[PDB]
């Protein structure tokens, strides 16, 4: 495993990873339609925020125009991490991906995604209610945010070494029933601020919830 190290992170990256995955409020809503905007690669959600002292609108970055054309004006579900710092170059928050078409994507009963954990090779039981979804087709972002929230609350994943954070290297694996893999290095952080750290979700990678499990490999070395 050629996993990136916790020590290799930039000055404020660790604290900002801690904010995104454990503290920061998430953009979680159903049945939303993007407004008229001439901007390429982005969806504008006017009046998304109700009673927020900083934001009114939500700006969603999808990367390409082909991804934007698929979701522009369409009925959509939102689940992702939003940020205000370095967003739109006012009263607007930004997000990378976390977009799924609303219609016919809901389940009758919420799918609890099983988590298989390994701390330096040792297997450890994870409560089943940690990672859960109500969607048939789910974004990787929706699952990763829930998985990294449990990791920080339990192990102090994004806490400093002096603050009890023992994990130095980590790997999150989203294993699909067909034998497909989506894997993110827990410490391969791009930059130090959410505008660059959350850029991994821009591709808007969506996977099937039916018979899907999560594989986690944590190392204190």
């Amino acid at each position, epitope marked *: 495993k050629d996993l990136r190290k916790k020590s290799e992170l930039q000055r404020n990256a660790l604290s900002n990873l801690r904010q995104i995955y454990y*503290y920061n409020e998430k953009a979680i809503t159903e049945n939303k339609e993007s407004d008229d905007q001439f901007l390429e690669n982005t969806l504008l959600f006017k009046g998304f925020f109700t009673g927020h002292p900083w934001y009114n609108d939500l700006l969603v970055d999808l990367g390409s125009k082909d991804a934007t054309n698929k979701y522009k004006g369409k009925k959509v579900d939102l689940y992702g991490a939003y940020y*205000g710092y370095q967003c739109a170059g006012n009263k607007t928050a930004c997000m990378y991906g976390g977009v799924t078409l609303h219609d016919n994507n809901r389940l009758t009963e919420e799918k609890k995604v099983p988590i298989n954990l390994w701390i330096d090779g040792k297997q450890t039981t994870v409560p089943i209610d940690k990672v859960k979804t109500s969607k048939k087709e789910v974004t990787v972002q929706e699952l990763d945010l829930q998985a990294r929230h449990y990791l920080h609350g339990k192990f102090g994943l994004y806490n*400093s*070494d*002096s603050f009890g954070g023992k994990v130095q290297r980590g790997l999150i694996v989203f294993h699909s029933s067909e034998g497909s893999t989506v894997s993110y290095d827990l410490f391969d952080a791009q930059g130090q601020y959410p505008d660059t750290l959350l850029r991994i979700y821009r591709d808007n990678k969506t996977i099937n919830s039916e018979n899907l499990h999560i594989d986690l490999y944590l190392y204190t070395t």
Partner: T-cell receptor
Amino acid sequence: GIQVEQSPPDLILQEGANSTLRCNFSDSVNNLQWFHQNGQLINLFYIPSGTKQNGRLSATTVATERYSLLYISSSQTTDSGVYFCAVDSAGTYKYIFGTGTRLKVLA
Amino acid sequence: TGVSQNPRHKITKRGQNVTFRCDPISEHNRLYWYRQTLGQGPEFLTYFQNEAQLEKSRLLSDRFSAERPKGSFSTLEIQRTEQGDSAMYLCASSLGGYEQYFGPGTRLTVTE
């Protein structure tokens, strides 16, 4: 890095007299503020450039010459305490406060 | 000013962990943390802009952790307090690079 120098460090004023407090800084500024401390920092002026007035108090900052002046007209015993100058400086952010001007107004 | 801080005063035995809270002016996106020792001016510890920590001073002990837990408010944790930690911990808020509004401060006394 960014350096702030306030003069005089200590000032003795007779009741009713006027005085000019100086703040010198090393680099170009985006934010310059003058404060008065009693342990609550009282905001006197936000002045990165130009001239402003606030009653018996007045301030002026020459951004190019890298200095800021604070004028106290008709000094009162309540004007006693520490006056602070603080800058942000337009690499790595740090908001730097000066050592301050401790003012003692003689009744 | 509109910036709140709790507790206003705090006594801790040396070696104990202490946590302070700052509630900024709602509209302000920027939040600052300062330390002020007797006779000296306020010293920059760290600052936030929205949900992100922008900078922490190079000379700031690994015993310090500043977070924005649930929106606007911020917490400052000092673990294993020592006599040298006895200071006035000041919090400030602003709309970007504009005027900073200070809180009443937290008087911390670290006793033996």
